[PDB]
């Protein structure tokens, strides 16, 4: 089968052969978008093009974009290690039409790449599609132009409980380009639990969301109002790791060549032997987001972007502790990561030494309190009555030991214990009040 690198290249080659300008992945950190924490989609760097404020010499483009979804509008941090399909860091394969072609040709390009004997040659019978309920045009295209049996065409409305809140209406954020979208799913088969989209078991890993095709139509305002974009446009987005799993005949993202090799490296540096333990998958994911974020300029801190990075690093170190790592390990994974990322890791390779040092320092810094904090947490959980850790304890771990509340929640979740978030926040607010009283005017 094709390697992840070969699949990445083949996608770009396909769209390049179809007249699309190949554009390099943007950084994970925008310089000119105050609404955006980290790059969460291939379309981010073309935001102003969709808005009609930025003109390019090309009207169609294709990219393999590095993304991090660990905060802001799209945040999958808490899914990592619990599903076979969610990462913090991942690559999004995209083609874009800037007032060029529209619905029919977008769908045709995607179907051709996925199912043509000349290309990916996926079995058509295992592919399902969803459309926005009101998008009769998209329904007709799939039914009559492509020829998907009606039983595998699913209409999805505002299923997230609010106007435009839907799996079939894609938004960059609370503001920005958005529109109805159509998605392509692949059935991994009855050896995996789950039902098709729209079904009660839709959240299972059986029917995997592979490719989202967004018909960009509006710019969302802060008030929630939709203002039409000057030209209806196309934003498509396919998870590289997810399509790689399909093409390499495996079911989990973590079973692709890239992750198999990376997980081996994690086992090596932690001294773990059970290659199936979920902590290995968590660490493998976390080194990708952490290393690339640092390569793109993020430094660990207690504020904004730096704190998200700090939180992920510390959670990774914690998982390493659970596996029995006896020495500083996380930075040792940068090399192995560079080795599996191919051309997509060039910015990381360029800054290998710097990234390694940042991660080493951060782990060493956290090690000053990690085991001591875990000891306290164990002590508190041992005598805890009920299914919820009190906010005061969570706050003490935060204030004394440098445990972000989500790191504490992560440890507790593994023992079916919740954290009183309201209590933690009350404790933080109480401390802020003390600070104001002491500092004065």
Buried b or exposed e, range 140-176, using 16+ CB within 10 angstroms: ebbbeebebeeebbbebebeeeeebebbbbbbbbebb
Report the site for ligand G5A in 412-431 (rule: CB under 6 A).
none
Contact 126, 140 (CB under 8 A): no
**Residues contacting residue 349 through CB under 8 Å, at least 6 positions apart:** 338
Query: Binding to ligand G5A by residue 46, rule CB under 6 A?
Result: no
Contact 337, 262 (CB under 8 A): yes
Q: C-beta of 193: minimal distance to ligand G5A in Å? A: 19
Q: C-beta of 171: minimal distance to ligand G5A in Å? A: 9
Strands (E), 259-355: none
**Alpha-carbon gap, residue 411 to 419, rounded angstroms:** 10
Q: Which range of residues in 139-147, 206-214, 291-299, 319-327 is near ligand G5A by CB under 6 A?
A: 206-214
Query: Total binding residues for ligand G5A by CB under 6 A?
Result: 19
- Residue number closest to ligand G5A, CB atom: 239
Query: Binding to ligand G5A by residue 235, rule CB under 6 A?
Result: yes
- Select the residue interacting with ligand G5A from 212, 270, 279, 289 (CB under 6 A): 212
Contact 239, 245 (CB under 8 A): no
Contact 258, 4 (CB under 8 A): yes
Query: Binding to ligand G5A by residue 214, rule CB under 6 A?
Result: yes
- Select the residue interacting with ligand G5A from 15, 38, 50, 90 (CB under 6 A): 90
Report the site for ligand G5A in 337-356 (rule: CB under 6 A).
none
- Give the closest residue to 57 by CA, choosing from 33, 23, 95: 23
Closest to ligand G5A by CB, 80 vs 325, is 80
Query: Binding to ligand G5A by residue 170, rule CB under 6 A?
Result: yes
DSSP 367: H
Q: C-beta of 87: minimal distance to ligand G5A in Å? A: 4
Query: Binding to ligand G5A by residue 288, rule CB under 6 A?
Result: no
Query: Binding to ligand G5A by residue 293, rule CB under 6 A?
Result: no
Q: C-beta of 234: minimal distance to ligand G5A in Å? A: 10
Contact 102, 232 (CB under 8 A): yes
- Select the residue interacting with ligand G5A from 66, 69, 103, 206 (CB under 6 A): 69
Query: Binding to ligand G5A by residue 182, rule CB under 6 A?
Result: no
Task: Label the pairing between strands 74-75 and 153-156.
Answer: unpaired
Query: Binding to ligand G5A by residue 296, rule CB under 6 A?
Result: no
CA distances from 68 to 72, 112, 163, 368 (A): 10, 28, 26, 28
Which residues would be at the binding site for ligand G5A (CB under 6 A)?
A: 41, 43, 69, 76, 86-87, 90, 92, 170, 209-210, 212, 214, 235, 237-239, 241-242
């Amino acid at each position: 089968s094709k390697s992840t690198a070969e699949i990445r290249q083949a996608f770009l080659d396909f769209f390049h052969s179809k007249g699309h300008q190949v554009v390099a992945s943007s950084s994970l950190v925008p310089h000119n978008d105050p609404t955006l924490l980290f790059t969460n989609a291939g379309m981010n760097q073309f935001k102003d093009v969709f808005l009609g404020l930025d003109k390019r010499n090309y009207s169609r483009a294709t990219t393999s974009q590095r993304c991090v979804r660990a905060g802001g509008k799209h945040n999958d941090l808490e899914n990592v290690g619990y599903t076979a399909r969610h990462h913090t860091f991942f690559e999004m394969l995209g083609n874009f039409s800037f007032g060029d072609y529209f619905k029919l040709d977008a769908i045709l390009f995607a179907w051709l790449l996925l199912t043509s004997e000349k290309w990916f040659a996926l079995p058509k019978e295992r592919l399902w599609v969803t459309v926005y309920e009101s998008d009769d045009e998209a329904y007709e295209i799939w039914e009559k132009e492509v020829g998907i049996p009606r039983e595998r065409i699913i209409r999805i409305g505002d299923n997230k409980g609010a106007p435009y809140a839907s799996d079939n209406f894609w938004q960059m954020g609370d503001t920005g380009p958005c529109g109805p979208c159509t998605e392509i799913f692949y059935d991994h088969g009855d050896h995996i639990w789950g039902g098709p989209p729209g079904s009660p078991e839709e959240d299972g890993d059986r029917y995997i969301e592979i490719w989202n095709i967004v018909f960009m139509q509006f710019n969302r305002q802060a008030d929630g109002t939709m203002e039409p974009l000057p030209k209806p446009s196309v934003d498509t987005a396919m998870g590289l790791e997810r399509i790689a799993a399909v093409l390499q005949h495996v079911n989990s993202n973590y079973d692709i060549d890239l992750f198999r090799t990376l997980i081996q490296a994690v086992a090596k540096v932690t001294g773990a032997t059970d290659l199936s333990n979920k902590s290995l998958r968590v660490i493998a994911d976390h080194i990708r987001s952490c290393a690339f974020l640092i390569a793109d300029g993020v430094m660990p801190s207690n504020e904004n972007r730096g704190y998200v990075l700090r939180r992920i690093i510390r959670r990774a170190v914690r998982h390493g502790n659970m596996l029995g790592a006896k020495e500083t390990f996380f930075y040792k994974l940068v090399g192995p990561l560079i080795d599996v990322m191919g051309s997509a890791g060039e910015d990381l390779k360029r800054q290998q030494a710097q990234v390694e040092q940042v991660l080493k320092t951060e782990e060493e810094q956290f090690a000053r309190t990690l085991e001591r904090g875990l000891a306290l947490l164990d002590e508190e959980l041992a005598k805890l009555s009920g299914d919820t850790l009190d906010g005061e304890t969570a706050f003490r771990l935060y204030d004394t030991y440098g445990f972000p509340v989500d790191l504490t929640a992560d440890v507790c979740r593994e023992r079916n214990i919740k954290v009183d978030e309201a209590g933690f926040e009350a404790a933080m607010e109480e401390q802020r009040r003390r600070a104001r009283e002491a500092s004065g005017f």
